[PDB]
Amino acid sequence: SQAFQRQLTALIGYDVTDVSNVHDDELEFTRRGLVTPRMAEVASRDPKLYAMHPWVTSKPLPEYLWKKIANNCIFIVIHRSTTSQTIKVSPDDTPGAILQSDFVLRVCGRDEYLVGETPIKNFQWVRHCLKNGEEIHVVLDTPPDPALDEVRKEVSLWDCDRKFRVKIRGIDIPVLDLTVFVEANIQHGQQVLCQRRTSPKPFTEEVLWNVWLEFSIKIKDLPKGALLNLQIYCKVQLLYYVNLLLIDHRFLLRRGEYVLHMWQISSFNADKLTSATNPDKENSMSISILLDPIALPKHEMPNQLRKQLEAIIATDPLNPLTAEDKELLWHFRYESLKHPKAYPKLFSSVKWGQQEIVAKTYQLLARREVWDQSALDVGLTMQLLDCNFSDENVRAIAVQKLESLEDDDVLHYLLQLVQAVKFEPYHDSALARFLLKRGLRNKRIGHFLFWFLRSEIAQSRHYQQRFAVILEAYLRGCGTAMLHDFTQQVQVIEMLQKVTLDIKSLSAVSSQVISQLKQKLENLQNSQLPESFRVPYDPGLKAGALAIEKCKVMASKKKPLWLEFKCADPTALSNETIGIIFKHGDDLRQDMLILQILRIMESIWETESLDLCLLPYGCISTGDKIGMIEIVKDATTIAKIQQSTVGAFKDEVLNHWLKEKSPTEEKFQAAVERFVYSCAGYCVATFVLGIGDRHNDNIMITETGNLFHIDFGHKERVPFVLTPDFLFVMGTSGKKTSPHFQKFQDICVKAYLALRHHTNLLIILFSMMLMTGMPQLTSKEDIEYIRDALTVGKNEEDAKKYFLDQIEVCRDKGWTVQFNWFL
Numbered sequence: 001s002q003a004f005q006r007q008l009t010a011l012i013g014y015d016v017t018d019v020s021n022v023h024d025d026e027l028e029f030t031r032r033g034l035v036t037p038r039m040a041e042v043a044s045r046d047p048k049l050y051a052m053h054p055w056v057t058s059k060p061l062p063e064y065l066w067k068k069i070a071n072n073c074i075f076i077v078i079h080r081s082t083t084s085q086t087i088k089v090s091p092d093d094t095p096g097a098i099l100q101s102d103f104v105l106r107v108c109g110r111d112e113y114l115v116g117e118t119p120i121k122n123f124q125w126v127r128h129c130l131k132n133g134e135e136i137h138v139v140l141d142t143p144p145d146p147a148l149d150e151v152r153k154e155v156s157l158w159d160c161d162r163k164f165r166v167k168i169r170g171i172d173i174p175v176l177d178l179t180v181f182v183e184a185n186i187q188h189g190q191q192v193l194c195q196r197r198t199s200p201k202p203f204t205e206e207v208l209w210n211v212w213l214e215f216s217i218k219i220k221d222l223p224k225g226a227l228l229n230l231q232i233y234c235k236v237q238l239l240y241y242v243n244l245l246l247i248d249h250r251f252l253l254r255r256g257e258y259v260l261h262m263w264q265i266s267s268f269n270a271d272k273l274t275s276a277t278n279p280d281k282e283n284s285m286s287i288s289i290l291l292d293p294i295a296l297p298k299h300e301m302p303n304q305l306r307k308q309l310e311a312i313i314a315t316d317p318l319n320p321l322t323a324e325d326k327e328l329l330w331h332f333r334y335e336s337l338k339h340p341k342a343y344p345k346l347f348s349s350v351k352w353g354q355q356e357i358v359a360k361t362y363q364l365l366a367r368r369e370v371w372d373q374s375a376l377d378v379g380l381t382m383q384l385l386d387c388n389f390s391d392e393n394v395r396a397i398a399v400q401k402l403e404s405l406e407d408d409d410v411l412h413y414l415l416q417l418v419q420a421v422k423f424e425p426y427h428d429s430a431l432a433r434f435l436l437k438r439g440l441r442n443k444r445i446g447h448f449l450f451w452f453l454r455s456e457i458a459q460s461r462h463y464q465q466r467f468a469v470i471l472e473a474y475l476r477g478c479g480t481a482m483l484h485d486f487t488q489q490v491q492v493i494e495m496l497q498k499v500t501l502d503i504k505s506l507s508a509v510s511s512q513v514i515s516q517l518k519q520k521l522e523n524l525q526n527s528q529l530p531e532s533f534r535v536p537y538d539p540g541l542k543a544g545a546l547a548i549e550k551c552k553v554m555a556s557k558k559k560p561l562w563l564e565f566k567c568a569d570p571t572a573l574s575n576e577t578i579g580i581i582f583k584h585g586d587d588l589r590q591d592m593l594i595l596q597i598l599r600i601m602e603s604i605w606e607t608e609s610l611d612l613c614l615l616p617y618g619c620i621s622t623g624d625k626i627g628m629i630e631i632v633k634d635a636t637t638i639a640k641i642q643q644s645t646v647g648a649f650k651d652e653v654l655n656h657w658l659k660e661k662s663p664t665e666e667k668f669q670a671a672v673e674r675f676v677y678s679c680a681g682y683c684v685a686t687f688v689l690g691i692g693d694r695h696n697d698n699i700m701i702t703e704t705g706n707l708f709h710i711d712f713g714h715k716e717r718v719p720f721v722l723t724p725d726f727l728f729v730m731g732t733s734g735k736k737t738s739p740h741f742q743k744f745q746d747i748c749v750k751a752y753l754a755l756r757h758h759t760n761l762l763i764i765l766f767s768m769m770l771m772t773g774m775p776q777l778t779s780k781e782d783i784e785y786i787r788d789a790l791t792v793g794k795n796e797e798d799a800k801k802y803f804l805d806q807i808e809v810c811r812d813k814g815w816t817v818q819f820n821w822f823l
């Protein structure tokens with residue numbers, strides 16, 4: 001009975017049933033509350049399509065992938081057992097229309113199927129074969145049994161004019177001179193509604209006050225999701241913070257005694273918002289407070305002015321609203337309501353500390369015919385789920401829009417939707433439930449949901465309880481088959497993690513350890529490494545037996561395991577191993593975010609028939625400074641190409657490294673073409689994200705020319721890497737204009753203005769990136785970089801003049817920054 005809950009725990013990596021670190025029942029309330037959305041989505045999903053999870057897209061096929069087809073014909077090799085016939089098919093042919101031309105077509109080597117009522121041009125696997133120029137090897141197979149996916153069954157607030165007040169009894173710490181004072185903030189979003197300090201006392205390991213801080217706000221004017229934020233300052237400096245939701249999950253005003261264990265500091269940072277209290281009771285500072293059945297209820301213009309308003313609606317998400325701007329938006333409430341783009345600013349004009357105002361806000365929300373009718377803008381939808389909005393109804397209108405996204409687009413934004421849960425005031429939310437049901441409706445979304453949630457639970461004390469509850473809610477309806485898969489995957493990576501860590505210690509980069517490594521690996525082949533497991537970063541591929549011959553450790557400072565496995569699938573029509581790098585040392589939650597932004601940029605370019613052959617490899621964080629990376633085959637760093645032929649830099653090297661790895665001049669030109677696309681993409685992307693000034697041992701190239709940056713987890717400068725050896729391949733010497741170098745420039749400018757057609761989307765994604773995954777780089781100035789980088793305000797023409805100049809700044813500096821590193 002209860003051994004299943006213990007199964008869920010080791011799967012989750014946290015004990016959801018625990019109550020050692022709560023001061024109310026919100027987490028347990030959210031467990032009981034999430035049962036409905038689960039049972040709905042479980043009961044409504046097609047068990048057969050759920051079992052085969054056909055990964056399909058409704059987008060148009062781009063112009064570049066069109067001209068790779070031979071007129072309404074595609075070859076599709078079907079396999080029986082030994083023999084295999086090869087059919088002509090029309091892009092618009094359904095999987096059924098190919099079958100006649102029950103059983104089901106499965107892709108060879110993978111747990112991936114081609115089924116359902118969409119044309120074969122709308123399966124991603126077929127767009128993957130078309131992109132790389134490969135042949136669609138399917139295999140007539142029996143459908144997988146839906147039995148296998150079975151699930152194991154289971155006084156009014158507005159009548160109170162009293163000013164709100166909180167008694168600060170004191171703070172205690174078991175171990176620490178200066179003086180110290182508590183600051184108590186009533187908050188809503190990042191907005192501070194009302195502030196009150198204590199008098200400064202001496203900072204001993206206990207400090208009492210017994211003081212009532214009376215706030216100017218009234219109990220009736222407190223809005224749901226209002227945080228009492230408590231902060232300890234000691235010329236001042238913030239040392240410890242904690243929060244407490246003044247209005248609870250039942251809409252009740254929060255009463256009584258609280259001893260809250262606080263978080264230390266090492267600033268817009270998503271950790272500063274959490275309702276969680278420090279679980280480390282022994283080392284942590286605590287504060288002691290007192291609050292004293294009060295429940296919350298629930299319910300044309302001048303020409304010049306129109307222009308001023310439209311000018312405000314037209315500005316970027318990061319452009320600050322003045323009081324003048326706000327008062328304008330609010331007064332012309334119903335004109336602002338006509339423009340979906342105004343909504344973020346409009347709701348940033350609301351005075352949330354004033355009952356009557358919020359009342360009118362909810363009135364205005366009831367008349368949102370234009371919003372509901374508008375075309376989904378993820379950019380706009382994202383802004384309403386960020387840290388500037390803590391109102392359920394505002395945030396629910398955002399989650400409304402997300403409902404319309406096809407599964408393929410959920411996948412695109414899943415990581416950042418998951419991180420958006422860090423900005424929710426309450427454990428139960430539209431957003432959490434949206435993630436929950438979309439995860440249970442689709443095994444691919446659910447797979448990655450599981451890892452994304454698990455990444456955070458494993459290493460964020462600030463949010464591991466919330467995500468833990470949401471994860472359990474997923475696990476209790478995913479199906480017995482997936483529970484078994486996750487259990488496998490967790491077991492496998494726990495083994496491999498141990499091996500990785502133990503081996504890191506054994507050096508201060510010797511090759512005598514190589515045998516000690518291959519020892520542990522060989523001696524883990526039998527117990528308890530299973531004979532198959534899903535690759536967590538690509539749930540298509542199952543991996544079976546190791547290849548202990550090929551497994552190595554790097555001449556490095558962090559000794560990552562280069563591992564390779566055999567594919568457990570016999571129908572796999574290839575000899576390629578599945579490669580995985582296990583690394584400790586870097587925090588890969590930053591690499592996940594950057595890589596996901598990269599895939600987002602690709603799909604953007606897809607809307608403008610552009611392709612820049614980015615290589616955003618799989619990467620999954622799994623624990624404290626530890627995770628896996630997909631191995632990109634046939635690849636090497638730009639530094640090693642220099643260190644082999646020089647040991648100290650030279651221009652030529654790259655080109656005859658390419659040419660030597662190109663078998664026929666035929667292909668070699670396909671490589672240098674690939675290099676111009678790849679190079680431009682990574683220059684565009686890295687300038688925008690402000691991670692372009694990289695040290696060439698962090699940039700890689702395949703044997704087919706594809707360039708790609710790596711290790712994103714990390715004087716005079718350079719906006720991106722466009723070194724002479726890159727230029728050499730293009731065919732330009734100091735100052736020239738090669739046929740390819742102009743094409744590079746051409747692509748860069750096309751791609752750069754292409755990103756700018758989604759400024760808002762990128763701004764919001766980038767802001768969220770910094771706030772939820774990168775604790776160090778979180779200030780207005782840090783965030784506003786991407787405004788500058790995207791040259792907000794500037795016209796397309798000036799923007800091209802801006803980017804091309806940047807290219808020149810790199811040209812101007814050649815090898816400087818690269819060399820300057822060695823010092």
Ligand SMILES: C[C@H](Nc1ncnc(N)c1C#N)c1nc2ccc(F)cc2n1-c1cccc(S(C)(=O)=O)c1
Nearest residue numbers: 552553554560561562617630631632636640710711
């Ligand atoms: C730096 C490179 N990174 C990647 N390599 C392949 N695929 C990737 N996705 C990455 C990344 N990121 C790398 N990481 C390694 C970890 C262990 C190991 F034994 C080797 C590793 N390499 C690597 C790969 C090729 C060549 C070299 S080398 C000979 O040191 O220049 C190192």
